[PDB]
Amino acid sequence: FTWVLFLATVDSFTTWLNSISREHIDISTVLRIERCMLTREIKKGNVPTRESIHMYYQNHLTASDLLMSKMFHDDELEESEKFYVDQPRFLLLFYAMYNTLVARSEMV
Amino acid sequence: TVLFLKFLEYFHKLQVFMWWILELHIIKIVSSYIIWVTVKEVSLFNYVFLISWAFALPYAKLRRAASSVCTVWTCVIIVCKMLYQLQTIKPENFSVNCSLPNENQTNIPLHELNKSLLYSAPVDPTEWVGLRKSSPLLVYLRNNLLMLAILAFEVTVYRHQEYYRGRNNLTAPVSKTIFHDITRLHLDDGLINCAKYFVNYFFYKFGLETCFLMSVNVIGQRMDFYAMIHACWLIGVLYRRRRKAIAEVWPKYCCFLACIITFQYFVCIGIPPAPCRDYPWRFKGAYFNDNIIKWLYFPDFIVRPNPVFLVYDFMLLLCASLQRQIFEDENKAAVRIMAGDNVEICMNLDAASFSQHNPVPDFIHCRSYLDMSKVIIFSYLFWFVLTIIFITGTTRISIFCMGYLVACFYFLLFGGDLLLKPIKSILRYWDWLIAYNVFVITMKNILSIAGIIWDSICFAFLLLQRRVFMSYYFLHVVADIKA
Ligand SMILES: *[C@@H]1O[C@H](CO)[C@@H](O)[C@H](O)[C@H]1NC(C)=O
Ligand SMILES: *[C@@H]1O[C@H](CO)[C@@H](O)[C@H](O)[C@H]1NC(C)=O
Fold first, then answer.
1. What are phi and psi of B123, to 5 degrees?
2. Which residue of B has its CA nearest to A33?
3. Which of B66, B155, B212, B423 has its CA 20 to 30 A from that of B226?
4. Closest CA in chain B for residue A46
5. HEC sequence for chain A
6. Closest ligand (CA of B101)
7. Which cysteines link up through disulfide bonds (chain B)?
8. Is there a contact between B162 and B171 (Cβ–Cβ < 8 Å)?
9. What's the CA gap between B450 and B458, in Å, rounded?
10. Are B207 and B323 in contact (CB under 8 A)?
């Protein structure tokens, strides 16, 4: 009877918490993508070369949202992202709360 | 009518599974019940049960004869106990009154209350042997009837499995387990597969980590002189740091456990009370009193050494024997290929220039479902055990809480950078912390002349984390931290 409105409210709540701290979420996302790229490289290649991301995007700087320019799309990354987005309810709420915590640790 | 076919099929499955699990886990049940019967009635004629099933667990070759010996002795005891119930036994003609002592010689420092053994009732020369002349004769003999039943049901299960091998021609499964198909390769596929793998080979991977915890339980719940002896041997065996370094002294440890449980039962049996001689620590000139004579596990009449304290030593002995068997059979390649390769790893490695060599697959990005559990148990547990170290140093306010707080602060400050280093230094520091923990345990045991529960949990979590640091799954986290 009321589970529909309950789920609507909790989904709106997670959307709110994700929206008010989108900057940290996107920074963490692009950092995670770069981490995956760098660990694949260091597993295959030789040297980390911190500027590897620089010489990589230079092919095809200051831009807080690099997500529209998808430059690295290794399949297991999208597999993990799909696994995270298909997570059940009352758990994405936990993800949003943890993102809020890591975003506002100073206030915490 | 309608469901009897499928129901009987399920029932046959259940019957064969029960027979299999009993064939797999019979020795533990029979030995545990025998030790419990021995502890219940402490008198003689049960000392031989303890000899048999204390020198039979570590040495499996004797497990055949050590069963028939008990099978014969229990019926001998039943016959004797029934014979001791006739009306023509007359313990009156048998009983002895021990004469009171005087204030000068062999005096009890508590002279106004001599209410103890040898003085509050006429002693019987057979009570010290086992015959007690009880009336119902059924509640008096059930501890032996059930023991005989278990001893018979053992060989019953053995020969039933043999006959099941004969008909429906099969072979004895060398893979002694429950799920014969689940193996090491099937571990990191699904959560259910991991649960099956752990139900299969839990004790294989976590033997020592459990034997040490059992010894710590013995120390913490016994808390007397023999607990100090157990602490001495625990520190002596842990001092050998490498795994293969203690696989040499484990038989000596098992022999020590057997000898000590034998000595403890021979102490708890006391001295024959028919001769009215008393113990040297109860004379005219003596300094031992009730508290110190209870702490020391010495024989006595006014205070009885609690026999139930031997079940902890028995648990420790059983786990030590199982771990000895594990050490014995873990080098065989046939089992090493399936849920094997339990040898420790080198300590000079690094996540860089090695992530392409380890057989373990990556889990940091959490493709599957259990990978979240893997990353929460291999990366986010260090800080949890640090919080546990903090908690165990603010609950029981004592002088030993300084080391806990110091180590907690140090690791919580210099933690993030230490995981960059090769595991050598972090393992050295964690070993120093293990040493401090066990030293605190031993000192809190010695100073009893308190109640360590948080220290045991801290020790368990530290052992878990130490086992984690020497795993292949950690190099992926080290690579992520490098990134
Ligand atoms: C021993 O003492 C009891 C009661 O104190 C008495 O009944 C008995 O006759 C005495 N002599 C014995 C049992 O030898
Ligand atoms: C104990 O020995 C001393 C010296 O032999 C004596 O004076 C005393 O009466 C004896 N009896 C007691 C109860 O001490």
1. -70, 155
2. B365
3. B66
4. B353
5. CCHHHHHHHHHHHHHHHHHCCHHHHHHHHHHHHHHHHHHHHHHHCCCCCCCHHHHHHCCCCCCCCCCCCCCCCCHHHHHHHHHHHCCCCCCHHHHHHHHHHHHCCCCC
6. 2
7. 98-276
8. no
9. 15
10. yes
Q: Is B245 exposed, middle or buried (0-12, 13-18, 19+ CB in 10 A)?
A: exposed
By the CB < 8 Å criterion, does B366 face chain A? yes
Whether the Cβ atoms of residue B292 and residue B109 lie closer than 8 Å to each other = no
Cα–Cα dist B52/B233, whole Å: 24
Q: Distance (Å, rounded) from C-alpha A99 to C-alpha B203?
A: 39
Which residues of chain A neighbour B369 with C-beta distances below 8 Å?
Answer: 83
Tokens of B245: 């370094």
Residue type, B433: L
- Distance, CA of B186 to CA of B336 (rounded, Å): 15
Distance of alpha carbon B425 from the chain centroid:
32
Distance from the Cα of A45 to chain B's closest Cα (Å) equals: 9
Could you say which residues from 199 to 258 on chain B have a Cβ atom under 8 Å away from some Cβ of chain A? none
In angstroms, the CA B136 to CA B82 distance is 11
Alpha-helical segments (H) within B223-282 = 225-239, 243-246, 250-268
Residue B8 has a CB neighbour count (10 Å cut-off) of: 10
* Six token digits for residue B353: 């220039």
Task: Give me the DSSP letters along B348-395.
Answer: S--STTTTTT-SSPP-TT--SSTHHHHHHHHTSSHHHHHHHHHHTTTS
- What does the alpha-carbon distance between residue B298 and residue B306 come to, in Å, rounded to a whole number? 11
Farthest CA pair distance, chain A: 60
Question: Which resolution, in Å, applies to this structure?
Answer: 3.8
Q: What was the elucidation method?
A: cryo-EM
